[PDB]
Amino acid sequence: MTLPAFKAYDIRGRVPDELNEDLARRIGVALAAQLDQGPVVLGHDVRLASPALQEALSAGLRASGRDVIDIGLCGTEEVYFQTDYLKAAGGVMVTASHNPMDYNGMKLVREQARPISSDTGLFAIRDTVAADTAAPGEPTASEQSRTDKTAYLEHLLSYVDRSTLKPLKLVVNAGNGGAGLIVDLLAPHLPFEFVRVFHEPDGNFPNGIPNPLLPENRDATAKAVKDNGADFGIAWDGDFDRCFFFDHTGRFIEGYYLVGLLAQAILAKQPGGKVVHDPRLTWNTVEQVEEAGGIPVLCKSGHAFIKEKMRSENAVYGGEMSAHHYFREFAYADSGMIPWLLIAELVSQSGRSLADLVEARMQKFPCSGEINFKVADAKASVARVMEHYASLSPELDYTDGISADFGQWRFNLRSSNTEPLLRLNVETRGDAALLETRTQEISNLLRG
Ligand SMILES: O=P(O)(O)O[C@H]1O[C@H](CO)[C@@H](O)[C@H](O)[C@@H]1O
Ligand SMILES: [Mg+2]
């Protein structure tokens, strides 16, 4: 076999059998051999095991003569920002993002925070780690503590014109992850009145693991918004590289619509720019980007494809329907902080509620949401669907699974690259009835 913890985009496994201090130190040694010259930035999330995992990573790296910059407890996006800002050779974030409590992992990048994935070094690291029986060497390089967030915070604030901000009332829900530390540091520089829910970092997660997609966790943010008459609410996953929005009615906003919203926000600052988006749900993004004078660029879903395409295109912003938002100026990396600052600035400047900013777009391009199927035979199942729709002659695109455009409706059907799973997305041209009948039709075919 091979080490299960090494996935397509990152390392994720149960502690201690899938991931432990010895593997972490071995990963540091193997990572040293993969990077260009320079030091390595290390950071970690709130999980109880994360500091020790970072400490082993450090020991392996310095045993290989790599200077380590320890930026401490942080969000995943701070490892991206600091790796790029400090012109490091690389960086690793120790995080479980949103996995259960007996789980942990790492997210690895090289220069300029470029991702290290299965096929761009991560499996090379895996195989080196898998075959490494050598004795732990002793450190021949140093560790520097660098917890100053000033540059990071100034960079967050630079996305908005602070004198145009209104004193909005915002619910913030860290889910006992790490987002609250950054909110509290931004707060003295912002006019908003914050309503803090599940604010303190707690690696035991007394209120549940930080996953705003769970309806139980969703409802705590919705309730705080409604009970306090907040303008909107924001929730983050544990390492807060994803954020999730709730309008003034408590309604969770499906992430598809935030791509076109955030693209328009950005395009008013950087006119004529290119905007990268995924193929799962498209029509609304294409229209909003073009309406805002931008150029939409279709790209295979997955954060490493998005970033690579943004780089080759000098795209100012890339957005994925699944709550990933990437920013050229942020080392082409994703942030869970920039999107809500942009949204709060848009609400402040426009005088429109978050609800009204998206409502007409949701009516014009209703979507199913991402619907997952675990089926006995994915390939046979997909063939059943294509067979059933063949007579209608859809316009097909194979950028990322199968996209079929029927005119008034379209779908994308993909195999997940991170899970053995089929993923379905359907949208229509302003037709909620057509949306439901087609979604159900495709579901039955897949389940057949
Ligand atoms: O559908 P997939 O292949 O399993 O990818 C999903 O996870 C990726 C990494 O978080 C994301 O980059 C993708 O956009 C998506 O959320
Ligand atoms: Mg995350």
Q: Report the distance separating Cα 164 and Cα 245, nearest Å.
A: 21
- Ligand 1 site-directed mutation target among 98, 118, 303, 413, most atoms within 8 Å of CB: 303
Q: Which CATH entry fits the domain spanning 169-246: 3.40.50.700, 3.40.50.2300, 3.40.120.10, 3.30.70.580?
A: 3.40.120.10
Same fold, 1-147 and 366-448: no
Torsion, Cα of 328, 331, 333, 339 (10° steps): -60
Q: Contact 60/28 with Cβ under 8 angstroms?
A: yes
Here the tokens at position 189 are 């520089």
**Residue 102: both structure tokens together:** 């007996």
Instruction: List 325's β-bridge partners, or say none.
Output: 319
Q: What are phi and psi of 11, to 5 degrees?
A: -110, 130
The secondary structure of residue 340, as a DSSP letter, is H
Please, are residues 426 and 409 in contact by the beta-carbon 8 Å criterion? yes
Q: What is the DSSP letter of 48?
A: T
Confirm if 262 and 342 have CB atoms less than 8 A apart: yes
Residues with a CB atom less than 6 Å from ligand 1: 9, 301-303, 320, 322, 324, 416-419, 423
Return the residue matching tokens 């910059």.
69
Dihedral of the alpha carbons of 442, 321, 243, 84, in degrees to the nearest 10: 140
Between strands 40-44 and 68-73, the pairing is parallel
Distances in Å between the alpha carbon of 154 and those of 145, 182, 208, 210, 339? 20, 12, 32, 26, 15
Q: Catalytic residues, which ones? A: 97
Do the Cβ atoms of 285 and 303 come closer than 8 Å?
Answer: no
Cβ-count burial 403-424 (b if 16+ within 10 Å, e if not): bbeeeebbbbbbebbeeeebbb
Ligand 2 center–CA 95 separation, angstroms? 8
8 A C-beta contact, residue 342 and residue 265: yes
Cα separation values, 342 from 44, 218, 335, 336, 360, Å: 26, 22, 12, 11, 20
**CATH ID of 1-147, from 3.40.120.10, 3.10.450.30, 1.10.230.10, 3.50.50.60:** 3.40.120.10
Q: Which residues pair with 170 in a beta bridge?
A: 194, 232
As its CATH architecture, domain 366-448 has 2-Layer Sandwich (3.30)
DSSP 138: P
- Domain boundaries of the chain, sorted by first residue: 1-147, 169-246, 247-365, 366-448
Q: Which residues of 58-91 are buried (b: 16+ CB within 10 A; e: fewer)?
A: bbbbbbbebebbbbebbbbbbbbbbbbbbebbbb
**H-run or E-run covering 85:** helix 76-85
What lies within 8 Å, CB to CB, of 291 at 6+ separation is: 264
What is the CA(419)–ligand 1 centre distance, in A? 9
Evaluate whether the domain defined by 247-365 bears CATH number 3.30.465.10.
Answer: no
φ, ψ of residue 68 in degrees (nearest 5): -110, 135
Look at strands 169-173 and 90-94 and give their pairing.
Answer: unpaired
Residue nearest to atom 13 of ligand 1 (CA): 302
C-alpha angle 219/221/222, rounded to 5°?
A: 60
Binning the chain into helix, strand and coil, the percentages to the nearest 5 are 40, 20, 40
Rounded Cα distance between 437 and 83, Å, is: 48
